Paper text:
The SARS-CoV-2 spike (S) glycoprotein is the main target for inducing neutralizing antibodies. RBD recognizes the main cellular receptor Angiotensin-converting enzyme 2 (ACE2), triggering entry by endocytosis and S2-catalyzed fusion with endosomal membranes, thereby establishing infection. The S conformation of RBD is in a dynamic equilibrium between either all RBDs in a closed, receptor-inaccessible conformation or one or two RBDs in the “up”, receptor-accessible, conformation. Up to 90% of the neutralizing antibody responses generated upon SARS-CoV-2 infection and vaccination target RBD, which is highly immunodominant.
Author numbering:
A (entry chain A): 304 to 337, 530 to 620, 641 to 676, 689 to 722
B (entry chain B): 723 to 825, 854 to 941, 943 to 1100
C (entry chain A): 950 to 1147
Write the structure that this text describes.
């Protein structure tokens, strides 16, 4: 609700992979309907013998019992199904979703921004994958600096030199080995009054 | 002795729309009539997460530079192997840290903490190196090296024991220190040692489980499945049922967020206490009784732990007391003499 | 941050009035003047439930913030007592360095402490030793350290380089040379002896 934005990272929107097509399947006979081809590794609107849902269908290693048709998780949500035509187990994964945040330096500085899609592999969406999600618009840099804008999992971002947003593993401070020995001591010769 | 303190908790975030009205435009339209509850809840949770990052920063990032111990481990007979990082391990955790560390999709997500466990381990290693190589000087200004034996002599002077005692019992003191560290190792290996910390983790897990389970309830509605209601009733009745479900689920979210705020305040207090102990117990010698374990505080060593910190408090405890006759003063030539520092004692003669 | 949180809470509370909570309208008089009592009462009950819930949420959040600020005020009072009305030996409780004193200042709904502290500045290396032998007896410094610039040994206070001659006054005797590890041989000046000679 502002015409000016300070430097930082802001949670703006939500990203939600949308389904591609509807998969309706019935046993090898006639389940009072016309079956469709099975689509794997894709966000689809599946319907198995009236059990409807939306998700990604993958080949599962779970071993349903002969009489078992569906699988449920701890929260009692559809976790896997058995294809009515070929007796195989399809694991169901919720279609990728997450938050969408905007990493920006202060608008008084520049209008360039980067976008973080939280907890999503951006193969599904100047692209940098990180444990916190995928960052787009930021240039990954090997050099480590002080954390200007925190992203997460040790990754921060900053507006640096011609100027652009860079992402880097934040440094914890200068390394300073202490000249320890069994007979040497350091003593101050002067002092300062600090307020 | 060992003291364990929670520092932070999981940074949870909830997509209210997916939680209540998952995949229902009509249900989202109905949500719109309830105002800006979603924005308020998101603001609260984001504030909690930022506060968790702040808590970790306060507790651990109390050192200006990353200090490192010398390659030669000659500290006058004191063995710190059980607390210093193990160079061979890919993740440079100390054995005690290894012992410590060894011990759903309805719009709910977990944000990674800003500082990885490796960075916290680096901070702990810096603190340990500073304490070992420079005593408490690095906590005030420029780190000043000092032989560890002389440092321990100063520690003894702090608790009112003449430093000659340490120089005359150095080997015995080193043996006792090493044995105590080994006992800490064994005690953690065998032992419910992680208390309030595991309680925090369990409370958060239970809160999330309750929030998820509340979705399956009806709150009086004909069904707990939104699409069921949409596909079995006309809009005039479907909207009433959806309103009932929305009210129930929104109340559940509000309860969850309020309880999370209370827990966040509690853990903020705990992290403040942990930071105070790091400052007054590790970066110095504390004269506050029982603030750093039983006995007279000699020093402390920090160790990281899942969402928490562990302090190894090294203290001095009197062991073998003996009786003597005492007197407040002594007469020599009509004048009373009082001890400058100590007591007058008599074995009988 | 506290000020902004309070302002935002009030703004949210005010904005919640414009919502409907499922009712036909957010204006009470509108409902009163468009519906009969049997239906108006249902709509008013809906609005009342919504607004009462909003008030309850506001009050609970205010209680939580009040507890937080009570803790903050307790900390501020403790700092005023231990840092301004005295000198604190609690490390980092009154800013970096060794606490010398503190000065309070008022601020909008808050307090500011100016902590004046002493920070060592220019450190120098010296050779050290735990004790010194004079005549078979070990001497330890009463207060300070034994330091050496390479040729001579002095006794100096720990926090400020100020060499002084090692005498029987600066040090105290305990035990002998056969115990302390790293002891060094040197001379302990006795102020009395010149007077006895003179």
């Amino acid at each position: 609700k502002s015409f000016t934005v300070e430097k930082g990272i802001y949670q703006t929107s939500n990203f939600r992979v949308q389904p591609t097509e509807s998969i309706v399947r019935f046993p090898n006979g006639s389940g009072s309907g016309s079956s469709t081809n099975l689509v794997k590794n894709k966000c689809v609107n599946f319907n198995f013998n009236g059990l409807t849902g939306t998700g990604v269908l993958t080949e599962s290693n779970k071993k349903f019992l002969p009489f078992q048709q569906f699988g449920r998780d701890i929260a009692d949500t559809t976790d896997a199904v058995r294809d009515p035509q070929t007796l195989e187990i399809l694991d169901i994964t919720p279609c990728s979703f997450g938050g969408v945040s905007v990493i920006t330096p202060g608008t008084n500085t520049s209008n360039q921004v980067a976008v973080l899609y939280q907890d999503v592999n951006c193969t599904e969406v100047n692209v940098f994958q990180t444990r916190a999600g995928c960052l787009i618009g930021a240039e990954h840099v090997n050099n480590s600096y002080e954390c200007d804008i925190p992203i997460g999992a040790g990754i921060c971002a900053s507006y640096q030199t011609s100027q652009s947003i860079i992402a880097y593993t934040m440094s914890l401070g200068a390394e300073n080995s202490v000249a320890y020995s069994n007979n040497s001591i350091a003593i101050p010769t002067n002092f300062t009054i600090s307020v | 002795t060992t003291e364990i303190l929670p520092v932070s908790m999981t940074k949870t975030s909830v997509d209210c729309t997916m939680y209540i009205c998952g995949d229902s435009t009509e249900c989202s339209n109905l949500l719109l009539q309830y105002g800006s509850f979603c924005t308020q809840l998101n603001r609260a949770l984001t504030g909690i997460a930022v506060e968790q990052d702040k808590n970790t920063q306060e507790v651990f990032a109390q050192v200006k530079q990353i200090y490192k111990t010398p390659p030669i481990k000659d500290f006058g007979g004191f063995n710190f192997s059980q607390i210093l990082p193990d160079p061979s391990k890919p993740s440079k955790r100390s054995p005690i840290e290894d012992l410590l560390f060894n011990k759903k999709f309805n719009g709910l997500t977990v944000l990674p903490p800003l500082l990885t466990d490796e960075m916290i381990a680096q901070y702990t290693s810096a603190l340990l190196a500073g304490t070992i190589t420079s005593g408490w000087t690095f906590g005030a200004g420029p780190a000043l090296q000092i032989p560890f034996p002389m440092q321990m002599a100063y520690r003894f002077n702090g608790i009112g024991v003449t430093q000659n005692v340490l120089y005359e019992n150095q080997k015995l003191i080193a043996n006792q220190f090493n044995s105590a560290i080994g006992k800490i190792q064994d005690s953690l290996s065998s032992t419910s040692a992680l208390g309030k910390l595991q309680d925090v983790v369990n409370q958060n897990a239970q809160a999330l489980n309750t929030l998820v389970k509340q979705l399956s309830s009806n709150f009086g509605a004909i069904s707990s499945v939104l699409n069921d209601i949409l596909s079995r009733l006309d809009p005039p009745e479907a909207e009433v049922q959806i309103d009932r479900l929305i009210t129930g689920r929104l109340q559940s979210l509000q309860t969850y967020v309020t309880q999370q705020l209370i827990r966040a305040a509690e853990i903020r207090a705990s992290a403040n206490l942990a930071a105070t102990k790091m400052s007054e117990c590790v970066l110095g010698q504390s004269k506050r009784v029982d603030f750093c374990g039983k006995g007279y505080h000699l020093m402390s060593f920090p160790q990281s732990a899942p969402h928490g910190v562990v302090f190894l408090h090294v203290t001095y405890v009197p062991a073998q007391e003996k009786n003597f006759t005492t007197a407040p003063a002594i007469c020599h030539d009509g004048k009373a003499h009082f001890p400058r520092e100590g007591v007058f004692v008599s074995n009988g003669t | 941050d506290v000020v902004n949180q309070n302002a935002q809470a009030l703004n949210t509370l005010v904005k919640q009035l414009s919502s409907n909570f499922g009712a036909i309208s957010s204006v009470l008089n509108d409902i009163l003047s468009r519906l009969d009592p049997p239906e108006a009462e249902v709509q008013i009950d809906r609005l009342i439930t919504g607004r009462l819930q909003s008030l309850q949420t506001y009050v609970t959040q205010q209680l939580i913030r009040a507890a937080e600020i009570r803790a903050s005020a307790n900390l501020a009072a403790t700092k005023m007592s231990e840092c301004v009305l005295g000198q604190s030996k609690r490390v980092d409780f009154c800013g970096k360095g060794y606490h010398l004193m503190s000065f309070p200042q008022s601020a909008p709904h808050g307090v500011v402490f100016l902590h004046v502290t002493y920070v060592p500045a220019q450190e120098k290396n010296f050779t050290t030793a735990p004790a010194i032998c004079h005549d078979g007896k070990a001497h330890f410094p009463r207060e300070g350290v034994f330091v050496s610039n390479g040729t001579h040994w002095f006794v100096t206070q720990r926090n400020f380089y100020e060499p002084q001659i090692i005498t029987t006054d600066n040090t105290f005797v305990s035990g002998n040379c056969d115990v302390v590890i790293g002891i060094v041989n040197n001379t302990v000046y006795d102020p009395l002896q010149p007077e006895l000679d003179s």
